Amino acid sequence: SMSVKKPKRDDSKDLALCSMILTEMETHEDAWPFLLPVNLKLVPGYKKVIKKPMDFSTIREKLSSGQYPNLETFALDVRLVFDNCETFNEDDSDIGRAGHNMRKYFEKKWTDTFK
Ligand SMILES: CC(=O)NCCc1ccccc1
């Protein structure tokens, strides 16, 4: 409340640490379905079904241009990539498996880096 503040968690390194995590996901061998936006002209039903498309290159752009107010907004966009993947792809597909693998990879890096 007014003039009563919890101790301040140090967030000064967050931008650099998120960039590092993003780099590791970009270089994962299973990253290939997620490196660029899905082509909305060539993929049947993707535009109508997937309300908020997201991919690693778009995250990298937003991160580099100060469009994430904080580390949670960044994690939300990473998770959106894999939530979109699950919605549109069968679990028993190369891309479906890639999504599950990358989500697991991300959440471990997330925990170890910030929690
Ligand atoms: C990342 C992602 O979901 N890409 C599209 C999956 C896809 C499925 C079927 C045909 C073409 C494309």
From Swiss-Prot:
Location in or out of the cell: Nucleus
Domain Bromo: 9-113
Tissue expression as described in the entry: Expressed at varying levels in several tissues, whereas a smaller transcript was expressed specifically in testis.
Subunit structure: Component of the BRF-1 ISWI chromatin remodeling complex, at least composed of SMARCA1 and BAZ2B, which regulates the spacing of histone octamers on the DNA template to facilitate access to DNA. Within the BRF-1 ISWI chromatin remodeling complex interacts with SMARCA1; the interaction is direct. Component of the BRF-5 ISWI chromatin remodeling complex, at least composed of SMARCA5/SNF2H and BAZ2B, which regulates the spacing of histone octamers on the DNA template to facilitate access to DNA.
Function in brief: Regulatory subunit of the ATP-dependent BRF-1 and BRF-5 ISWI chromatin remodeling complexes, which form ordered nucleosome arrays on chromatin and facilitate access to DNA during DNA-templated processes such as DNA replication, transcription, and repair. Both complexes regulate the spacing of nucleosomes along the chromatin and have the ability to slide mononucleosomes to the center of a DNA template. The BRF-1 ISWI chromatin remodeling complex has a lower ATP hydrolysis rate than the BRF-5 ISWI chromatin remodeling complex.
Family: Belongs to the WAL family.
Protein name as catalogued: Bromodomain adjacent to zinc finger domain protein 2B
Residues shown, of full length: 2054 to 2166 of 2168
